[PDB]
């Protein structure tokens, strides 16, 4: 897709596999979106147990951010930033709007997280 990110989900699966999974999820849940969430390269943070998420479309990016902070057990003092196609998304946007504007040809929205505000730093 756009951007210059690297996601292990894409390293691990060819496009045809990903598109079949993403299309299936999109069809089955019209009011939710499929999202891949992974730690950015070099980020000094834990990985999630799962990297595929089914997210309500009206959940805001901000609320999703708080959920991921909890999943990786961050302390309040710890920094964390989301990146989508190399841009930190606004917290007031809905996940559905973020999905519409950024999802890739395999129908997944890809979100990276890092303790740094520059992707890959």
């Amino acid at each position: 897709g756009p951007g210059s990110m690297k996601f292990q989900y894409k390293e691990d699966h060819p496009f045809e596999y990903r598109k079949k999974e993403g299309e299936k999820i999109r069809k089955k849940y019209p009011d939710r979106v499929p999202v891949i969430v992974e730690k950015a390269p070099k980020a000094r943070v834990p990985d999630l147990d799962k990297r595929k998420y089914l997210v309500p479309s009206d959940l805001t990016v901000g609320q999703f951010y708080f959920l991921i902070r909890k999943r990786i057990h961050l302390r309040p003092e710890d920094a964390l930033f989301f990146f989508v196609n190399n841009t930190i998304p606004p917290t007031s946007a809905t996940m559905g709007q973020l999905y519409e504007d950024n999802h890739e040809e395999d129908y997944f929205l890809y979100v990276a997280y890092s303790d740094e505000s520059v992707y890959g730093k």
Partner: peptide
């Protein structure tokens, strides 16, 4: 479970 490779977000 069959399809538990995805985390389903609810409130």
């Amino acid at each position: 479970e069959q399809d538990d490779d995805i985390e389903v977000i609810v409130d």
